[PDB]
Design an enzyme around this catalytic site. Sequence first.
Site, PDB file in Angstrom:
ATOM      1  N   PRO A 113       0.806  -1.219   0.000  1.00 14.98           N
ATOM      2  CA  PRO A 113       0.000   0.000   0.000  1.00 14.98           C
ATOM      3  C   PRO A 113       0.838   1.267   0.000  1.00 14.98           C
ATOM      4  O   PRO A 113       1.885   1.289   0.592  1.00 14.98           O
ATOM      5  CB  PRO A 113      -0.760  -0.081   1.321  1.00 14.98           C
ATOM      6  CG  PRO A 113      -0.797  -1.508   1.655  1.00 14.98           C
ATOM      7  CD  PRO A 113       0.445  -2.107   1.106  1.00 14.98           C
ATOM      8  N   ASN A 114       0.374   2.267  -0.729  1.00 15.60           N
ATOM      9  CA  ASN A 114       0.898   3.630  -0.729  1.00 15.60           C
ATOM     10  C   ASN A 114       2.111   3.828  -1.620  1.00 15.60           C
ATOM     11  O   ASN A 114       2.515   4.938  -1.874  1.00 15.60           O
ATOM     12  CB  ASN A 114       1.201   4.132   0.685  1.00 15.60           C
ATOM     13  CG  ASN A 114      -0.024   4.160   1.564  1.00 15.60           C
ATOM     14  OD1 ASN A 114      -1.005   4.794   1.250  1.00 15.60           O
ATOM     15  ND2 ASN A 114       0.032   3.443   2.645  1.00 15.60           N
ATOM     16  N   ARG A 151       3.871  13.614  -5.462  1.00 11.54           N
ATOM     17  CA  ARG A 151       3.527  14.836  -4.753  1.00 11.54           C
ATOM     18  C   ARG A 151       4.408  16.038  -5.051  1.00 11.54           C
ATOM     19  O   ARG A 151       4.004  16.923  -5.797  1.00 11.54           O
ATOM     20  CB  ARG A 151       3.379  14.615  -3.249  1.00 11.54           C
ATOM     21  CG  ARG A 151       3.065  15.893  -2.484  1.00 11.54           C
ATOM     22  CD  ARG A 151       2.248  15.627  -1.240  1.00 11.54           C
ATOM     23  NE  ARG A 151       2.874  14.628  -0.390  1.00 11.54           N
ATOM     24  CZ  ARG A 151       3.821  14.877   0.499  1.00 11.54           C
ATOM     25  NH1 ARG A 151       4.255  16.109   0.693  1.00 11.54           N
ATOM     26  NH2 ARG A 151       4.311  13.888   1.212  1.00 11.54           N
ATOM     27  N   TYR A 209      10.948  15.585  -3.512  1.00  7.96           N
ATOM     28  CA  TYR A 209      11.012  14.144  -3.257  1.00  7.96           C
ATOM     29  C   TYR A 209      11.424  13.208  -4.411  1.00  7.96           C
ATOM     30  O   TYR A 209      11.484  12.010  -4.221  1.00  7.96           O
ATOM     31  CB  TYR A 209       9.692  13.665  -2.652  1.00  7.96           C
ATOM     32  CG  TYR A 209       9.268  14.432  -1.426  1.00  7.96           C
ATOM     33  CD1 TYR A 209       9.801  14.133  -0.186  1.00  7.96           C
ATOM     34  CD2 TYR A 209       8.343  15.459  -1.508  1.00  7.96           C
ATOM     35  CE1 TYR A 209       9.430  14.836   0.939  1.00  7.96           C
ATOM     36  CE2 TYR A 209       7.964  16.170  -0.387  1.00  7.96           C
ATOM     37  CZ  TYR A 209       8.511  15.848   0.835  1.00  7.96           C
ATOM     38  OH  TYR A 209       8.147  16.536   1.962  1.00  7.96           O
ATOM     39  N   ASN A 254       7.909  -5.574  -1.547  1.00  5.24           N
ATOM     40  CA  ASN A 254       7.921  -4.452  -0.645  1.00  5.24           C
ATOM     41  C   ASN A 254       6.544  -4.319  -0.006  1.00  5.24           C
ATOM     42  O   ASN A 254       5.630  -3.751  -0.568  1.00  5.24           O
ATOM     43  CB  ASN A 254       8.342  -3.184  -1.352  1.00  5.24           C
ATOM     44  CG  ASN A 254       8.365  -1.980  -0.441  1.00  5.24           C
ATOM     45  OD1 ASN A 254       7.946  -2.029   0.702  1.00  5.24           O
ATOM     46  ND2 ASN A 254       8.886  -0.905  -0.946  1.00  5.24           N
ATOM     47  N   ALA A 272       3.683  -0.623   4.587  1.00  5.63           N
ATOM     48  CA  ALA A 272       3.117  -0.610   5.936  1.00  5.63           C
ATOM     49  C   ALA A 272       2.719  -2.011   6.449  1.00  5.63           C
ATOM     50  O   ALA A 272       2.786  -2.275   7.629  1.00  5.63           O
ATOM     51  CB  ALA A 272       1.954   0.349   6.032  1.00  5.63           C
ATOM     52  N   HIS A 285       4.732  -4.465   9.114  1.00  7.20           N
ATOM     53  CA  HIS A 285       4.641  -4.416  10.555  1.00  7.20           C
ATOM     54  C   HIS A 285       3.323  -4.916  11.131  1.00  7.20           C
ATOM     55  O   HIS A 285       3.193  -5.043  12.313  1.00  7.20           O
ATOM     56  CB  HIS A 285       4.915  -3.000  11.040  1.00  7.20           C
ATOM     57  CG  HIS A 285       5.914  -2.267  10.219  1.00  7.20           C
ATOM     58  ND1 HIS A 285       7.253  -2.567  10.233  1.00  7.20           N
ATOM     59  CD2 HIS A 285       5.766  -1.260   9.337  1.00  7.20           C
ATOM     60  CE1 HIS A 285       7.889  -1.765   9.409  1.00  7.20           C
ATOM     61  NE2 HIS A 285       7.007  -0.960   8.856  1.00  7.20           N
ATOM     62  N   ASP A 321       1.571 -15.591   6.393  1.00 10.58           N
ATOM     63  CA  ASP A 321       0.967 -16.887   6.212  1.00 10.58           C
ATOM     64  C   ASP A 321       0.709 -17.265   4.744  1.00 10.58           C
ATOM     65  O   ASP A 321       0.821 -18.401   4.392  1.00 10.58           O
ATOM     66  CB  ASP A 321      -0.204 -17.100   7.145  1.00 10.58           C
ATOM     67  CG  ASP A 321       0.240 -17.260   8.594  1.00 10.58           C
ATOM     68  OD1 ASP A 321       1.447 -17.286   8.844  1.00 10.58           O
ATOM     69  OD2 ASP A 321      -0.610 -17.326   9.471  1.00 10.58           O
ATOM     70  N   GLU A 362      12.611  -9.439   0.942  1.00  9.08           N
ATOM     71  CA  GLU A 362      11.916  -8.252   1.403  1.00  9.08           C
ATOM     72  C   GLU A 362      12.680  -6.974   1.046  1.00  9.08           C
ATOM     73  O   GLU A 362      13.859  -6.867   1.285  1.00  9.08           O
ATOM     74  CB  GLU A 362      11.678  -8.337   2.905  1.00  9.08           C
ATOM     75  CG  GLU A 362      10.917  -7.172   3.486  1.00  9.08           C
ATOM     76  CD  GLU A 362      10.702  -7.277   4.982  1.00  9.08           C
ATOM     77  OE1 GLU A 362      11.002  -8.305   5.572  1.00  9.08           O
ATOM     78  OE2 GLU A 362      10.218  -6.332   5.554  1.00  9.08           O
ATOM     79  N   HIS A 407      12.582  -2.579   1.070  1.00 11.21           N
ATOM     80  CA  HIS A 407      12.078  -1.256   1.414  1.00 11.21           C
ATOM     81  C   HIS A 407      12.910  -0.114   0.826  1.00 11.21           C
ATOM     82  O   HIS A 407      14.112  -0.124   0.899  1.00 11.21           O
ATOM     83  CB  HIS A 407      11.985  -1.098   2.927  1.00 11.21           C
ATOM     84  CG  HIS A 407      11.114  -2.116   3.566  1.00 11.21           C
ATOM     85  ND1 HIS A 407       9.749  -1.980   3.632  1.00 11.21           N
ATOM     86  CD2 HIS A 407      11.403  -3.313   4.115  1.00 11.21           C
ATOM     87  CE1 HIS A 407       9.239  -3.037   4.223  1.00 11.21           C
ATOM     88  NE2 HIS A 407      10.220  -3.865   4.516  1.00 11.21           N
ATOM     89  N   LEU A 408      12.251   0.880   0.265  1.00 11.17           N
ATOM     90  CA  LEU A 408      12.963   2.020  -0.275  1.00 11.17           C
ATOM     91  C   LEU A 408      13.730   2.751   0.822  1.00 11.17           C
ATOM     92  O   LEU A 408      14.873   3.070   0.678  1.00 11.17           O
ATOM     93  CB  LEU A 408      11.988   2.996  -0.936  1.00 11.17           C
ATOM     94  CG  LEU A 408      11.181   2.480  -2.119  1.00 11.17           C
ATOM     95  CD1 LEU A 408      10.101   3.447  -2.536  1.00 11.17           C
ATOM     96  CD2 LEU A 408      12.091   2.127  -3.264  1.00 11.17           C
ATOM     97  N   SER A 409      13.056   3.003   1.920  1.00 14.83           N
ATOM     98  CA  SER A 409      13.635   3.734   3.027  1.00 14.83           C
ATOM     99  C   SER A 409      14.258   2.818   4.073  1.00 14.83           C
ATOM    100  O   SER A 409      13.997   1.639   4.108  1.00 14.83           O
ATOM    101  CB  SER A 409      12.612   4.668   3.645  1.00 14.83           C
ATOM    102  OG  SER A 409      11.664   3.948   4.380  1.00 14.83           O
ATOM    103  N   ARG A 456      13.596   4.913  11.455  1.00 17.14           N
ATOM    104  CA  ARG A 456      12.295   5.503  11.647  1.00 17.14           C
ATOM    105  C   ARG A 456      11.622   4.909  12.905  1.00 17.14           C
ATOM    106  O   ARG A 456      12.218   4.139  13.604  1.00 17.14           O
ATOM    107  CB  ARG A 456      11.397   5.121  10.476  1.00 17.14           C
ATOM    108  CG  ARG A 456      12.008   5.543   9.148  1.00 17.14           C
ATOM    109  CD  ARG A 456      11.178   5.149   7.948  1.00 17.14           C
ATOM    110  NE  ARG A 456       9.938   5.898   7.872  1.00 17.14           N
ATOM    111  CZ  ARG A 456       8.900   5.561   7.125  1.00 17.14           C
ATOM    112  NH1 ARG A 456       8.939   4.484   6.369  1.00 17.14           N
ATOM    113  NH2 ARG A 456       7.826   6.309   7.129  1.00 17.14           N
ATOM    114  N   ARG A 460       8.388   0.504  13.274  1.00 17.09           N
ATOM    115  CA  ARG A 460       8.873   0.087  11.965  1.00 17.09           C
ATOM    116  C   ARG A 460      10.034  -0.933  12.047  1.00 17.09           C
ATOM    117  O   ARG A 460      10.389  -1.535  11.086  1.00 17.09           O
ATOM    118  CB  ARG A 460       9.218   1.297  11.093  1.00 17.09           C
ATOM    119  CG  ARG A 460       8.002   2.121  10.692  1.00 17.09           C
ATOM    120  CD  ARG A 460       8.299   3.266   9.734  1.00 17.09           C
ATOM    121  NE  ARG A 460       7.238   4.256   9.753  1.00 17.09           N
ATOM    122  CZ  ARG A 460       6.132   4.175   9.032  1.00 17.09           C
ATOM    123  NH1 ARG A 460       5.951   3.165   8.213  1.00 17.09           N
ATOM    124  NH2 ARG A 460       5.210   5.113   9.120  1.00 17.09           N
TER     125      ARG A 460
END
Lengths: 151, 151, 151, 151, 151, 151, 151, 151, 151, 151, 151, 151
Positions: free
Chosen positions: B11-12, B19, B24, B76, B79, B82, B89, B100, B102-104, B109, B113
């Site tokens: 998600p996201n 934006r 960014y 990825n 959210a 976590h 499962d 796995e 993650h960009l960040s 953080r 997280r």
Amino acid sequence: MSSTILVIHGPNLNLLGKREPEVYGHLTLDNINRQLIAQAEQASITLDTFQSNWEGAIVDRIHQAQTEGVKLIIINPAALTHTSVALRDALLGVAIPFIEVHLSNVHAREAFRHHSYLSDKAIGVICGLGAKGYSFALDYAIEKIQPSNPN
Amino acid sequence: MSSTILVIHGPNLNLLGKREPEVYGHLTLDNINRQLIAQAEQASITLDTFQSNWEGAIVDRIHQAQTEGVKLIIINPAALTHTSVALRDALLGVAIPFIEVHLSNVHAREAFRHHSYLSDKAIGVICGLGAKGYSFALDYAIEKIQPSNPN
Amino acid sequence: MSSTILVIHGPNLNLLGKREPEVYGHLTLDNINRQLIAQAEQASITLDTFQSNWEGAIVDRIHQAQTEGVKLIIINPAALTHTSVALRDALLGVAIPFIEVHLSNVHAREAFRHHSYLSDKAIGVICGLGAKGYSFALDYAIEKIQPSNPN
Amino acid sequence: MSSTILVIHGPNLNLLGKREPEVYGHLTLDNINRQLIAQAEQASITLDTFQSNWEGAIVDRIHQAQTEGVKLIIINPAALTHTSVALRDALLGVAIPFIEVHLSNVHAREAFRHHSYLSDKAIGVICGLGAKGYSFALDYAIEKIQPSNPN
Amino acid sequence: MSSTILVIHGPNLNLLGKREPEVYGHLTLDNINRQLIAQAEQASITLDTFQSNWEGAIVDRIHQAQTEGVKLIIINPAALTHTSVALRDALLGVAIPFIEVHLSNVHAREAFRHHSYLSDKAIGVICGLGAKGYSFALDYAIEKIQPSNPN
Amino acid sequence: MSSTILVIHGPNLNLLGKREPEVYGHLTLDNINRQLIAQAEQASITLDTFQSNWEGAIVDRIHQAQTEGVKLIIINPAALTHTSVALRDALLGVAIPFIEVHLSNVHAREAFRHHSYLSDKAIGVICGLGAKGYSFALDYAIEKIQPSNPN
Amino acid sequence: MSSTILVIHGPNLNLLGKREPEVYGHLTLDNINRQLIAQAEQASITLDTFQSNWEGAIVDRIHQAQTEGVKLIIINPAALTHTSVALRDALLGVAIPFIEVHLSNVHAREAFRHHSYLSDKAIGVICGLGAKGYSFALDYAIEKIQPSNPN
Amino acid sequence: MSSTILVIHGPNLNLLGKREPEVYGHLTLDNINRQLIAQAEQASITLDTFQSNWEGAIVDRIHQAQTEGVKLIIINPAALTHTSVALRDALLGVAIPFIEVHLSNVHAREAFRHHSYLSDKAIGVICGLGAKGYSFALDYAIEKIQPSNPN
Amino acid sequence: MSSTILVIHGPNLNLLGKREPEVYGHLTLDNINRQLIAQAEQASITLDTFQSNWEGAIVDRIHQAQTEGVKLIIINPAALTHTSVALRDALLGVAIPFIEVHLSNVHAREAFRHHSYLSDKAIGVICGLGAKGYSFALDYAIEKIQPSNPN
Amino acid sequence: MSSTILVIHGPNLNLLGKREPEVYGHLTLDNINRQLIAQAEQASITLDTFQSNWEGAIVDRIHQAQTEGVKLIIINPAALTHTSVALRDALLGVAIPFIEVHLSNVHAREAFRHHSYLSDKAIGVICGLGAKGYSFALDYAIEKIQPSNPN
Amino acid sequence: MSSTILVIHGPNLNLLGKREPEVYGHLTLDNINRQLIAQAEQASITLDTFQSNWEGAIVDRIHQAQTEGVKLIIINPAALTHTSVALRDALLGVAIPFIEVHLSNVHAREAFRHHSYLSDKAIGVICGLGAKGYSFALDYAIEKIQPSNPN
Amino acid sequence: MSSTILVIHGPNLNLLGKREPEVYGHLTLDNINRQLIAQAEQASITLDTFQSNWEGAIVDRIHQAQTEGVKLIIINPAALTHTSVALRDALLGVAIPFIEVHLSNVHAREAFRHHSYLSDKAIGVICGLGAKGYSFALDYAIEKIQPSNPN
């Protein structure tokens, strides 16, 4: 409106019986549902079943259950037991009593599996007894609804 | 269609570059996919990509992957890393190895997280290297799936 | 010597490929260093490597790096990642950005391995991808150490 | 070699002298040592100074202090304060009273910095007063060793 | 030319007043929405509303809000407040300021209800004041967005 | 006759016997080693000993043990038991079984002394029995190395 | 008065020197105050002092300090250090920099004494150095305001 | 007719709209009180106000409110929210219903601010909405005291 | 029974060697006792043994030991080590010094096994060395009771 | 095709129905035992029962079960479930598989009741379904021991 | 001024018997004090009593007690029991032995009431026995202070 | 025949006065019982007493107490207070009100002693007042069972 039992299967339960040749196969979700349906028919109780990988679909189904007049829910939340407050709130919001069922023994696994957002509000919990667990939940459910004497 | 490697974005992630690009960055999720699909083509590997804000859709996609015979997943979870046991499962249920991404840098953080429901079962994890993280994961996956020349 | 990139290996990394595999691979610390040096040579990047079982020696090397004009550090702190604040403080003290690398998946082992004194200050972290993790870090580093149109 | 007072500086403190890790404000470790030596001479008290990035070297120095008949240690353990039980044990083992000093305020930074393996066994702790913290420790030590009229 | 303010109701909110109106509320979600819409018109502010039991639907709606130029969100996340980082990430990712509202007093029920993934990033929080809480949030939003009075 | 036992003494153990009449008596580290060497001699077992205050020196010594064919290690890590993952990883890395010994009873002191990075991987642990604890570990080691029957 | 430096003593400090002047000997709060006032007079700096057992009285005094143009506060909160956020908020609210002082070594006593609501916001902390800790704090404050220097 | 609502402002709130409290908001406490008084007067409700830096004074004021027959309390405990059991016991002891108000968003600040000794017993809680929070609390309170219908 | 030593084995120790003697080993509790009794016979020290599955029996036996003039207890509390305060209190009540022994390494098993209600009060602890553990405890005990280290 | 199932009832279960039916009165421990015995007789399976208030008695009984060749244990440990390691060790030691049953829902009562020293080692757990829980366990057990039937 | 025994009542105790007497009981704080004074008079011991809602006032009273020659304090700290280090330090500072009394059973109420800053230093604690608790404390105090023998 | 009030002493209480008479105290368990029995006879109340080191015997006695018609239990569970859920369940099962008594102050000893499985269900708790604590509990009980205000 009458008395129905609803069986809800949570995410990933559709996977049952793909392992197949040895470790857990060949038994399937449909096989489980078919047995429960037969068990219910034998007691003259209307039983419906539902499975989804989507939490919102499960919540919607519970809401529909209230309007439908369902008297008790047998739910195997699967992974959702550890994570879903929304599920707990849906069940509480509709005030339909429920029994929590797990095929595996949630206590014999990782520590996070010990925690549940459902168990404390369930009438009862069964885990680790496989498919029989649903049958047991159904047997209990029938007595509670159509108590004691049938003859 | 059928696929050897599947890339899943949680998600996201669709918000990327959408934006304030001058602040960014202009890079979009689509750019990331385009880059990966081309990288995959260089190896004659069939690559699929998927993004959703809905957990159930991601779970369904993972189930679909088993049927397709996907050999490895690059995910990825965003959210969901976590919060989602259901995702863990699903991956475990289909037994498809995964990396796995993650960009960040998740460790840089909030404390929440720091915890992942995926990381312990992943082959490996990459975070904080931006888009290149996906490429590295793809490079590792290709080598594992079709071993060639080591470096 | 002056180097732009420094690769640091922590305690026990010297053991790699030593107690033969089985128990792991024939890959050695020397193979990794060879691979990295070639990759840097191909990019016209000057790279140095270092390993030690002594924390103070590692702290000294980092201090030296500041004088040598090193722009980025790729460090596999190994066991020291969970224990050494002195290591974190050396890196912060010289203010050289760094990438943290582990061969194995830190998250798939004891709970104490989950925690690091380095990860939150790293640009990024790569774990569980074996030797290729170092190569990925080097690949990122060469790309970062490029434009300078930033300020 | 047989000093009354011993000042120990821990890991990374050398960076004050080589060019500031943060920092404030190009006051060097050598400058601090000169000031303390002069302060000690002014009181006709013998003082030695020591710095190391290596835990073992510090431990050895403390042992040496016992044979030299050092009466008090002023120690800035730096990062070691949070990690080194070996340091605590060296100090207790030789039974030399000590004062703990930090230039920065250890409580104003990460939560992990709140904890020490030394502070509970120190006569006292000074932090956040910069270089002046060492001087105060010395003033206290002088009065304790060579009592005079009120100070 | 769509809306300035968006109100999101989380899962199970659709149940309000549904059963059984005599014990507990008569009031329904549509009643709440009608009051808010009337309140918005009186201020010449465009207001939209959304409810869902699916987290992904809410995330999609929030993304949609950015495209529509929504200035502020008033959200009652309900159960999702304690579980959804995805929701938190959506609101942050779009960077639309929000006010969090709960009809009931979240602090007066189970301990887990005390924790929110949204509250820390909200402008403000209102709980336990029932329906008026949404109105209050709207009053605040209107003054923020169109602070009618010169001062 | 090839079988060799190595005894490792950790930081501060060199201090044993300095404040002799009261503080912890007259037994020295050398006294301990002589007794162990003699005990080994009687059993026709080769034994070597090592002490250091420097963790790196100890780690190197362990690596050297692998190459020297050492069968078993008797280690008194002292303060390092609570702090050094590096030590754990060296022992695990060379795969030499070990027994952990402490003169004092660790459980009888500060709570932080309750935790070890070694104990769970040791064959066994002995604490609080003084110097005899080393002899007992040797007795066990000799039997494991050259098992004996009735005679 | 107005004054440039303000010393605040928290609850129970009025007890100093009262009981068993062979417990903690003969030093009183007034003795400390006189010594400080004299030390301040040497610098031509005006110093005020205050003690109370009432938290509100201390908060009121701190507020008064702002109007009076106090430049620095030296505060021994005593018991309030572990309990009073109101104290923390008064000091932050008036934005007067402060140094925290304790006669005894807080870390050497019960675990609850290890936490301070002030330390993280103080310039510095001194503990365990007895009455001299106040003098040290004063010397630092004077130097900050009117600096003199050998180095 | 005839009704009193009491607003209690806790420690340090007297600083509002001064110079530099942490968050300088332009409005003073008196300005806030005057708005509230006007709002109450519109409803023919008496609004008493009280501020103090002393916990005991606040407790006494609450007892006074019971003797005087105050209908409801709106309280911003400020720092006391996190620390005062005595306040919670005072409100409980008199059994006057209350609403808890904070100008700032308590959740957005240190973790210790996350806990309130009043929130679980309050009708409701408002935070982070600035001065408007008090007004909202009052609006709810008047409606609770004087349900519109029938007067 | 002069200079009597008492050996106590806790619950389930009676099972030793009963099941799957191959696979699990054939040493029995009686074998251990016979060995201890013989070892004791050699030193001319009186020794008794006791085992029970009942906490009350063990507590009574300990009370009996004091009257009997027992000088030291060697105890393997087994499961009771982690649960019985009553055992701790019995041993403390009679003031009979004790050594705690376990056949297996308690630290290598579940986390709950890491805590003992005895260990902090034992002279020493031995775990993971099997039957020899009791022998070592006895060996230490004999020296302590009737020291003949010196011929 | 006849075997041995043992039912074990823990402390206080003997109270069932002995006071104030209906609290939940009437049903007794013997009533439960008769039903089970009858249920077993119908299957031509041999069943024994045991209840005790004494942990040691239960542990003895379990050991006896081994000698008796008991195939499976159905145990309601009652209070012992949260406290008895000795019990866990007894069942593991004899290696007889077991099902854990509770009349009430342990998850719905105090937090200490949420923890079991047995559940992780159980085949399965049933709680909150009352007396029926035992029958279900027996039904599962019968199928486990004698699978081939008219089913 | 001058009493042998001092009874201190903490915040909110002045409310006893104040509201809903028929509901909550008619007993008042003065009734309690009157009983105690009478019990004291019977034994020919001077007794004084004190209550306040202000912590500082209580601390001052305790300080006064030292000068007065008070031999024992019976204190019901009420809410202050869980929060006041200052109170603990006051009692310790004057070194007057004390007994802690609560009308209600602290352990039956919320978890935060389970901790006391006084209990560990009291001679003894009585809770949940209502007013009689003070009387019992007084009975113990009398026997402690004065020889049992009359005349 | 049978008692109205029952006093239960837990494990190890039989030791009272046995060792260290001069250091310990020479009061025995029998002395306490005789004092209680006399205090009871003085109010024309039958009192029975019981002690065991066996938890089961204590539980059995409590069950017996219900059938005997015992009005109230005074219990010193000793070590069992911290471990025995079975004890709590027995008292609750018979629904006989109880007062919990300890000779020593539990709060002044190890942290584990701070928790009780009875305290929250007791009417009241007394600790640290020696033998008198039982007498005080009896006094309360007599007044509770046969009040003298009616008379």
